[PDB]
Amino acid sequence: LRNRLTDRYWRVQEVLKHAQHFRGRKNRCYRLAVRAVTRAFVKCTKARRLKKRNLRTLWINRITAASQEHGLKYPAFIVNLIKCQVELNRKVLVDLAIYEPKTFKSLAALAKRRQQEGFAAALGDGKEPEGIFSRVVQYH
Amino acid sequence: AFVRLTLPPPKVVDRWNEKRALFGVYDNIGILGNFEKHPKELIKGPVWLRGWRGNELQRCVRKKKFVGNRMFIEDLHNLNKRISYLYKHFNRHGKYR
Amino acid sequence: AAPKNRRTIEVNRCRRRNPQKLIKIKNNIDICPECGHLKQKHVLCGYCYEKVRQETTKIRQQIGAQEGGPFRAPSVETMVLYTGEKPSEKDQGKRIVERNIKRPSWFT
Amino acid sequence: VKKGFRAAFRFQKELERWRLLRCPPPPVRRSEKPNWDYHAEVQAFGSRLQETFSLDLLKTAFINSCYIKSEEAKRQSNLKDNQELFEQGLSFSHRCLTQFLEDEFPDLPAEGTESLVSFLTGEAVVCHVARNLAVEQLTLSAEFPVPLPVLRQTFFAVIGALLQSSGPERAALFIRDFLITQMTGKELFEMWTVVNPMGLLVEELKKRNISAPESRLTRQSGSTTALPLYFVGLYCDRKLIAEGPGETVLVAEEEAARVALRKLYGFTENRRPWDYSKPK
Amino acid sequence: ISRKWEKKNKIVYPPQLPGEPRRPAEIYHCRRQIKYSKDKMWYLAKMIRGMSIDQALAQLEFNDKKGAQIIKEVLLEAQDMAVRDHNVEFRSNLHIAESTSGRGQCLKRIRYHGRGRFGIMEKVYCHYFVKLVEGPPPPPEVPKTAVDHAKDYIQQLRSRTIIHTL
RNA sequence: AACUAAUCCUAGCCCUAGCCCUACACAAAUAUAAUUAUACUAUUAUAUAAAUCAAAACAUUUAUCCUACUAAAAGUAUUGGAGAAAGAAAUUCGUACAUCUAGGAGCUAUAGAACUAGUACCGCAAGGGAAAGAUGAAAGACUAAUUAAAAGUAAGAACAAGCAAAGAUUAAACCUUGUACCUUUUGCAUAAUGAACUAACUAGAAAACUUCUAACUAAAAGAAUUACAGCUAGAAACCCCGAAACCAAACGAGCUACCUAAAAACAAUUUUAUGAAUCAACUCGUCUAUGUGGCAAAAUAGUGAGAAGAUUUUUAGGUAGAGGUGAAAAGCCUAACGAGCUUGGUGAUAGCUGGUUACCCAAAAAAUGAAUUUAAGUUCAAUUUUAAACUUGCUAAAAAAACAAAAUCAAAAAGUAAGUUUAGAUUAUAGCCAAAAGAGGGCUCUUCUGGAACGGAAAAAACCUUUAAUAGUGAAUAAUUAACAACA
RNA sequence: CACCAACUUCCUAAACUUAAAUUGGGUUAAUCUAUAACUUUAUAGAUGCAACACUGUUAGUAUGAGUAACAAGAAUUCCAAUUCUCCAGGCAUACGCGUAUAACAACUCGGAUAACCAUUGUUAGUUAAUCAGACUAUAGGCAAUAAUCACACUAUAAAUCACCUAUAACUUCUCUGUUAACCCAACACCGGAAUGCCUAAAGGAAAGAUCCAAAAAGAUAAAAGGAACUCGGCAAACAAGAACC
RNA sequence: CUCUUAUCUUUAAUCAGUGAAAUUGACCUUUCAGUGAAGAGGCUGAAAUAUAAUAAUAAGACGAGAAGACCCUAUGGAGCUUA
Ligand SMILES: [Mg+2]
Ligand SMILES: [Mg+2]
Ligand SMILES: [Mg+2]
Ligand SMILES: [Mg+2]
Ligand SMILES: [Mg+2]
Ligand SMILES: [Mg+2]
Ligand SMILES: [Mg+2]
Ligand SMILES: [Mg+2]
Ligand SMILES: [Mg+2]
Ligand SMILES: [Mg+2]
Ligand SMILES: [Mg+2]
Ligand SMILES: [Mg+2]
Ligand SMILES: [Mg+2]
Ligand SMILES: [Mg+2]
Ligand SMILES: [Mg+2]
Ligand SMILES: [Mg+2]
Ligand SMILES: [Mg+2]
Ligand SMILES: [Mg+2]
Ligand SMILES: [Mg+2]
Ligand SMILES: [Mg+2]
Ligand SMILES: [Mg+2]
Ligand SMILES: [Mg+2]
Ligand SMILES: [Mg+2]
Ligand SMILES: [Mg+2]
Ligand SMILES: [Mg+2]
Ligand SMILES: [Mg+2]
Ligand SMILES: [Mg+2]
Ligand SMILES: [Mg+2]
Ligand SMILES: [Mg+2]
Ligand SMILES: [Mg+2]
Ligand SMILES: [Mg+2]
Ligand SMILES: [Mg+2]
Ligand SMILES: [Mg+2]
Ligand SMILES: [Mg+2]
Ligand SMILES: [Mg+2]
Ligand SMILES: [Mg+2]
Ligand SMILES: [Mg+2]
Ligand SMILES: [Mg+2]
Ligand SMILES: [Mg+2]
Ligand SMILES: [Mg+2]
Ligand SMILES: [Mg+2]
Ligand SMILES: [Mg+2]
Ligand SMILES: [Mg+2]
Ligand SMILES: [Mg+2]
Ligand SMILES: [Mg+2]
Ligand SMILES: [Mg+2]
Ligand SMILES: [Mg+2]
Ligand SMILES: [Mg+2]
Ligand SMILES: [Mg+2]
Ligand SMILES: [Mg+2]
Ligand SMILES: [Mg+2]
Ligand SMILES: [Mg+2]
Ligand SMILES: [Mg+2]
Ligand SMILES: [Mg+2]
Ligand SMILES: [Mg+2]
Ligand SMILES: [Mg+2]
Ligand SMILES: [Mg+2]
Ligand SMILES: [Mg+2]
Ligand SMILES: [Mg+2]
Ligand SMILES: [Mg+2]
Ligand SMILES: [Mg+2]
Ligand SMILES: [Zn+2]
């Protein structure tokens, strides 16, 4: 036995420290703990991407609740704000509804009015003056 | 795994004992001595591998030539069996032909 | 049929620590007035019973000596007397057993 | 038995870790531990805060009376206390803090502006602030960890030393930065304790010659269940002044009183943020 | 093998100051090698947990298991040393804080079967541990009342926060 | 707050150097059934080693085994189913450490000898053959301590829901997402092998040619060798476990088969005058149930056959594996005989099964053609690949041919970065599904194209959307099982 | 008349582009040696240089599971004691075994549990001229006629040293076996084991305590019917008989 | 057998003592329809659902141990017979 590995104690502890919060023999038996830890790491990596998608669904759900209190569907509210050159994202809109109820109501009226202007422009045909809020500022 | 619960006793090495101090002296006996002696003649070891090197099969066959006739019965039986095993490995087995 | 899997320590703890398998506590333990040793209400005291049986052996040992052999059962009643006591008239013609020691206080 | 001492050396370190967790060591003051020079540490204290101090004054502040007693007892087997600086430093802070509060909240009652000053000069705030500025490390005393009354005293002595060296204007900035900051996010009544809020409200309304409020039930939900919500609004002259939520009518009504008071004294949540912009 | 239970009796605290509650006494005792299974001894050790010395000795005297007699003798020696060596005033003023069983060193033998086969037999042994603490037994458990249950439920509802938002 | 455990250093060993040996151990006993004081009754190795194995079979043949100084001549002359392989001499060279009674980039209790011991134990015998120990200067100081430390348990059973975790969260569980691991299969598994858990042990080895780094250079090398820039030195490489067999020499007939010698048993009843009859003792084992790790590695409970004979039984001796014995069942020869057992040849051989231990970066297959006692394997082409030299490649491609009435061919241009030659090297040589065109009539072949999601079609290897892979509580989009009963 | 939806693409910071035998390259865990360093490090030279997997080898500990299975006749005045209830191969010799023999003391290991020892330790034991074994004077000469109650009687398989002639010696008891609940079968195994006497005068104990479920095994009884059962009268029966191929 | 029944002994069950074996990737171990390799406790869609023991049945876990048999291959063997 000329040369023998003298570090096996610390190589074992690297795996087992990640398994202390498991239940069963998975938290103390190396041949079992090693299989469980790698499955956990794979799940951890795939859940970094899925987290971002989940939060967007939460934002859209809460926005629909806030708009419907004022009689608006989600597609109408979001689309018309864009046509008014408002570039607030969904994450910040949720903050206003929860924490700034009066400001959110003001935005609700603005989106509704722009929708009405579009309806009038559609039904009326020919050359007619454009809506007050339907004027687009230009950049160069 | 289980590890020592105490430190082993210290090892103290004298780097200036006679063997260490004079290592290498007379390695140039030939060039500085008019070539009366070759440096290989300064080597101490088994009779059959002084100033010579080879693979395991070559070492086994060389040992038999030098001291084969002065060996014990059982030692010689094992040496002969080792030769035949090495012969079949080196001449019939391996990745490369 | 053989087990298809090992049973875990968690499942095993639930089988053998169930309240059905534990030792029940006893409510019928009391103290004996005469000796002060413990007993169950529906059972005789062991310490007090032990006294009586020891005396019974002594009497029977004496009865064996008098008879001297098997098949010697008398056809008349028996009675026991202790040192300092003499048969009464009613005791006439009844087997008498003699004990060296004095009459025990509990024995009447 | 394997050859080598390196694995044995490593394991001794882990045995050290295990022993510490099971038997935590008693606390020790940093002065005892290595890498300590008193003179250098004091100078860095001033420069850290971007303030200039006189070395002789600043050192006196840290010395405490209890420390002197211990040294003499050991001596048998000069110095100079910080008592003078403590009294001066505390006095200015009380006046300076009052001046800040009155300008910000003139309407708020006098008793109120005493509770807040008492709140911001108590052991809880002062001890918490003192430790994070290293005051505890530099203190000289006979007991460690330093008791809170001792720790509090040395803190104000330092402000006193700052006052002498650099004058009032500098110290006012010092109190604003480190003491006034501690009231961020704190609701009024969390720092001032008032029982029977309605009684106080009635007196305050009388002073401005306003009629006593009329309690009414603005909104209601789930009254008969075990989780009811109530909104009670105080109406004055048929005009709404405050509205409050609660579990029960009595609790909700009391809540409306606190809402009203806060508006009167101008300590509302949406009040103008404090101003640290001034460099002067 | 480890023998730490024995040494626990030799701890010495510094004298208590006048303004302090009186510290109760503690006694540790065990019997080491016993020809009995530890699984079986567990049921006996479990029963007397929390009881006073007199109540424990009463229940043991009327149990039919072989382990009951061995536990009783260990209990009697613990009581004797408590008064004699650990400055306990009254014998009756004691209760069982801890009682448990442990595995001992065992022996391996052969068990015969019917076709020239065999099996491995174990002759099993166990330990017994106890700790005696001076004072009346601590009061028993009281189940939560209906009012206590509800108060927890409101506390849970009050703890809620708005999740994943500013 | 601790049980079971764990920590340790020296007992010895291994390979060389040196040297022949003169060790042949009170009294008594022992070759007789050894260890029994005296006569019977004589005492004595062996003709040439074989086979496995290599020749991809096998039949001549197959290094060492089966020893005669180192270095060279030389793997040369010669021998050989002239093939696997085998292999000299003439002739040159050499006094060697030389008290080195000494040494170690050898092992430290699963290592090193099997060894504390050829003991305990197993076998009739030849023969096979283990395990383990740990205080201190002093025990004439009560046997020492040290360690959250393995699996296993205890302290302390459990609480709707699910490969047991991950994103999370004020909050352990509730909500959302998610078809265990290795090997093998067609790149596919809810297929099928393997794993109760812990600790230790347990599997790639050589220098002909090539590339890299130096010395000297028409010469290099410390004698024998190579040379039209060479030559010398260094570094760089090719696994483990597992048969049924075959041969040589011992050991076995206390079981069983048959034989030799000396001995023994057989009541009662009817017949007679006996391989007769009824039926015990005794010998055998028809049929059924129980038993099946059994009381038993072939039994128990009943029920059955013979029982003065070719009967049964005891003691001692004989025949031995190319053999013996056999009222022939290819039965029996010490529980496993179509040919005993043990040791050695022996690390037998295995184109077949299983396994083959740290990280990162980069590139990459097809699984077509040809020969083969070849199709469970191998060699050559073709592919891929690393390095080097230097110059045209890929897509496209007019007319004008050759064909018959889209494959060749490749001017000039344009979009674009590969291609040829030289040197070295393996692995691989069975695919699978979808969509076209045929040919033998749902399979079976041949030919062209595409594929191997983490999104979608309900789950979903092969259909559709998709240029690599990173952090973020940003944003715009892609594919996307559904579609809106009469007259006229 | 739109929205939602893949690291596809853009944005802040970065990056510089598509399963697998095989192939080309940069690092590194551990230990030893040279020279250094001094709470465990540096440059070089080395090697028995790294295991979640071979129905791998050795040791340890779980699961199945406190489960399957194992055992001592009754009362008393007490286990070499008395009496009672029931069962029915015992005593010697040969072969083999080798202290298991007896007393005391122990209560660890052994008996598959206790009591008690068959276990551990210490001390003791089996006595022969008759029972059993071993037991050296020499050389010659010579044999027709079984046994079975041996008479009758036949038969067929044809059948257990003595006595004489000569030579030599001319009083003797040492040596060895002797115990037992015992041997061959891995075991305190429902198995195997020769001969003589005898058949209870010798030798023994089927039930640890309690309860009276299912299923399973063994025994006995059964109305009316009597092979209708089943591959088959297998098994059982108040039957145990007859005939034919 | 129609057509089964009753009793006793052994087993069984409860208490006391001693105490094995094959087996075992991990398990927090449900039903129905669909998908699929005649195949799902674990996948898709629905539904059901406080926690643990003791005694029973044998549908499933392609249930466990099978030295259990049929088909094919190898320039693997052995016994027997010959022309
Ligand atoms: Mg998205
Ligand atoms: Mg459960
Ligand atoms: Mg076991
Ligand atoms: Mg061959
Ligand atoms: Mg020559
Ligand atoms: Mg060894
Ligand atoms: Mg060994
Ligand atoms: Mg542990
Ligand atoms: Mg869940
Ligand atoms: Mg198979
Ligand atoms: Mg398996
Ligand atoms: Mg390991
Ligand atoms: Mg014989
Ligand atoms: Mg015989
Ligand atoms: Mg007769
Ligand atoms: Mg026979
Ligand atoms: Mg007959
Ligand atoms: Mg007959
Ligand atoms: Mg006859
Ligand atoms: Mg025949
Ligand atoms: Mg035949
Ligand atoms: Mg045999
Ligand atoms: Mg091999
Ligand atoms: Mg092809
Ligand atoms: Mg051919
Ligand atoms: Mg092949
Ligand atoms: Mg061109
Ligand atoms: Mg991309
Ligand atoms: Mg790959
Ligand atoms: Mg290794
Ligand atoms: Mg293994
Ligand atoms: Mg167990
Ligand atoms: Mg069970
Ligand atoms: Mg049962
Ligand atoms: Mg049972
Ligand atoms: Mg009995
Ligand atoms: Mg005896
Ligand atoms: Mg005795
Ligand atoms: Mg004895
Ligand atoms: Mg005689
Ligand atoms: Mg004789
Ligand atoms: Mg005798
Ligand atoms: Mg047997
Ligand atoms: Mg048995
Ligand atoms: Mg008798
Ligand atoms: Mg019974
Ligand atoms: Mg009957
Ligand atoms: Mg009838
Ligand atoms: Mg019929
Ligand atoms: Mg029928
Ligand atoms: Mg019959
Ligand atoms: Mg029991
Ligand atoms: Mg469940
Ligand atoms: Mg189904
Ligand atoms: Mg499902
Ligand atoms: Mg079933
Ligand atoms: Mg069953
Ligand atoms: Mg199966
Ligand atoms: Mg072939
Ligand atoms: Mg062949
Ligand atoms: Mg052959
Ligand atoms: Zn009494």
mmCIF file with all atom_site columns, C-alpha atoms in Angstrom, chain D residues 77-133:
data_model
loop_
_atom_site.group_PDB
_atom_site.id
_atom_site.type_symbol
_atom_site.label_atom_id
_atom_site.label_alt_id
_atom_site.label_comp_id
_atom_site.label_asym_id
_atom_site.label_entity_id
_atom_site.label_seq_id
_atom_site.pdbx_PDB_ins_code
_atom_site.Cartn_x
_atom_site.Cartn_y
_atom_site.Cartn_z
_atom_site.occupancy
_atom_site.B_iso_or_equiv
_atom_site.pdbx_formal_charge
_atom_site.auth_seq_id
_atom_site.auth_comp_id
_atom_site.auth_asym_id
_atom_site.auth_atom_id
_atom_site.pdbx_PDB_model_num
ATOM 1  C CA . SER D 1 77  ? -1.812  46.325 45.117 1.00 0.00 ? 77  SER D CA 1
ATOM 2  C CA . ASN D 1 78  ? -4.018  61.024 37.287 1.00 0.00 ? 78  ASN D CA 1
ATOM 3  C CA . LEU D 1 79  ? -6.574  60.966 34.465 1.00 0.00 ? 79  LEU D CA 1
ATOM 4  C CA . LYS D 1 80  ? -9.628  63.230 34.194 1.00 0.00 ? 80  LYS D CA 1
ATOM 5  C CA . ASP D 1 81  ? -13.290 62.314 33.805 1.00 0.00 ? 81  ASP D CA 1
ATOM 6  C CA . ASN D 1 82  ? -15.678 63.221 30.993 1.00 0.00 ? 82  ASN D CA 1
ATOM 7  C CA . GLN D 1 83  ? -18.346 64.411 33.440 1.00 0.00 ? 83  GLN D CA 1
ATOM 8  C CA . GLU D 1 84  ? -17.979 68.052 32.384 1.00 0.00 ? 84  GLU D CA 1
ATOM 9  C CA . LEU D 1 85  ? -18.271 67.245 28.680 1.00 0.00 ? 85  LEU D CA 1
ATOM 10 C CA . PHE D 1 86  ? -21.247 64.923 29.202 1.00 0.00 ? 86  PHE D CA 1
ATOM 11 C CA . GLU D 1 87  ? -23.378 67.620 30.826 1.00 0.00 ? 87  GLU D CA 1
ATOM 12 C CA . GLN D 1 88  ? -22.563 70.190 28.142 1.00 0.00 ? 88  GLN D CA 1
ATOM 13 C CA . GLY D 1 89  ? -23.084 67.779 25.251 1.00 0.00 ? 89  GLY D CA 1
ATOM 14 C CA . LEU D 1 90  ? -26.436 66.480 26.475 1.00 0.00 ? 90  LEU D CA 1
ATOM 15 C CA . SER D 1 91  ? -27.767 69.977 27.175 1.00 0.00 ? 91  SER D CA 1
ATOM 16 C CA . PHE D 1 92  ? -27.091 71.276 23.663 1.00 0.00 ? 92  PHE D CA 1
ATOM 17 C CA . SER D 1 93  ? -28.571 68.171 22.039 1.00 0.00 ? 93  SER D CA 1
ATOM 18 C CA . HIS D 1 94  ? -31.852 68.598 23.918 1.00 0.00 ? 94  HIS D CA 1
ATOM 19 C CA . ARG D 1 95  ? -32.075 72.247 22.860 1.00 0.00 ? 95  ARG D CA 1
ATOM 20 C CA . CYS D 1 96  ? -30.887 71.549 19.312 1.00 0.00 ? 96  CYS D CA 1
ATOM 21 C CA . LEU D 1 97  ? -33.314 68.654 18.853 1.00 0.00 ? 97  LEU D CA 1
ATOM 22 C CA . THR D 1 98  ? -36.198 70.774 20.139 1.00 0.00 ? 98  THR D CA 1
ATOM 23 C CA . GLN D 1 99  ? -35.303 73.550 17.693 1.00 0.00 ? 99  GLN D CA 1
ATOM 24 C CA . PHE D 1 100 ? -35.392 71.130 14.751 1.00 0.00 ? 100 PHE D CA 1
ATOM 25 C CA . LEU D 1 101 ? -38.757 69.662 15.727 1.00 0.00 ? 101 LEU D CA 1
ATOM 26 C CA . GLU D 1 102 ? -40.620 72.910 16.421 1.00 0.00 ? 102 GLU D CA 1
ATOM 27 C CA . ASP D 1 103 ? -39.815 74.417 13.018 1.00 0.00 ? 103 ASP D CA 1
ATOM 28 C CA . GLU D 1 104 ? -40.810 71.223 11.201 1.00 0.00 ? 104 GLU D CA 1
ATOM 29 C CA . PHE D 1 105 ? -44.010 70.684 13.235 1.00 0.00 ? 105 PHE D CA 1
ATOM 30 C CA . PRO D 1 106 ? -45.010 74.004 14.836 1.00 0.00 ? 106 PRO D CA 1
ATOM 31 C CA . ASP D 1 107 ? -48.616 72.968 15.495 1.00 0.00 ? 107 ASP D CA 1
ATOM 32 C CA . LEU D 1 108 ? -47.694 69.777 17.334 1.00 0.00 ? 108 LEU D CA 1
ATOM 33 C CA . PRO D 1 109 ? -48.182 70.068 21.120 1.00 0.00 ? 109 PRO D CA 1
ATOM 34 C CA . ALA D 1 110 ? -45.358 70.830 23.522 1.00 0.00 ? 110 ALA D CA 1
ATOM 35 C CA . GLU D 1 111 ? -45.712 67.515 25.358 1.00 0.00 ? 111 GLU D CA 1
ATOM 36 C CA . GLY D 1 112 ? -45.362 65.734 22.020 1.00 0.00 ? 112 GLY D CA 1
ATOM 37 C CA . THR D 1 113 ? -42.109 67.474 21.109 1.00 0.00 ? 113 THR D CA 1
ATOM 38 C CA . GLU D 1 114 ? -40.802 66.346 24.510 1.00 0.00 ? 114 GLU D CA 1
ATOM 39 C CA . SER D 1 115 ? -41.595 62.662 23.970 1.00 0.00 ? 115 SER D CA 1
ATOM 40 C CA . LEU D 1 116 ? -39.819 62.580 20.605 1.00 0.00 ? 116 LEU D CA 1
ATOM 41 C CA . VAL D 1 117 ? -36.698 64.187 22.081 1.00 0.00 ? 117 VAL D CA 1
ATOM 42 C CA . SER D 1 118 ? -36.836 61.724 24.975 1.00 0.00 ? 118 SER D CA 1
ATOM 43 C CA . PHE D 1 119 ? -37.333 58.940 22.427 1.00 0.00 ? 119 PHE D CA 1
ATOM 44 C CA . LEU D 1 120 ? -34.274 59.991 20.408 1.00 0.00 ? 120 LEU D CA 1
ATOM 45 C CA . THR D 1 121 ? -32.004 60.415 23.459 1.00 0.00 ? 121 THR D CA 1
ATOM 46 C CA . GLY D 1 122 ? -32.918 57.118 25.111 1.00 0.00 ? 122 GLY D CA 1
ATOM 47 C CA . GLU D 1 123 ? -30.629 54.168 25.649 1.00 0.00 ? 123 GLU D CA 1
ATOM 48 C CA . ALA D 1 124 ? -32.194 52.177 22.806 1.00 0.00 ? 124 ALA D CA 1
ATOM 49 C CA . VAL D 1 125 ? -31.367 54.641 20.023 1.00 0.00 ? 125 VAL D CA 1
ATOM 50 C CA . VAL D 1 126 ? -28.115 55.982 21.477 1.00 0.00 ? 126 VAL D CA 1
ATOM 51 C CA . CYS D 1 127 ? -26.633 52.571 22.302 1.00 0.00 ? 127 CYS D CA 1
ATOM 52 C CA . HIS D 1 128 ? -27.573 51.240 18.864 1.00 0.00 ? 128 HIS D CA 1
ATOM 53 C CA . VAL D 1 129 ? -25.983 54.230 17.120 1.00 0.00 ? 129 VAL D CA 1
ATOM 54 C CA . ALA D 1 130 ? -22.921 54.217 19.382 1.00 0.00 ? 130 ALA D CA 1
ATOM 55 C CA . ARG D 1 131 ? -21.832 50.647 18.629 1.00 0.00 ? 131 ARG D CA 1
ATOM 56 C CA . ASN D 1 132 ? -21.892 50.987 14.836 1.00 0.00 ? 132 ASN D CA 1
ATOM 57 C CA . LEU D 1 133 ? -19.581 54.029 15.029 1.00 0.00 ? 133 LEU D CA 1
#
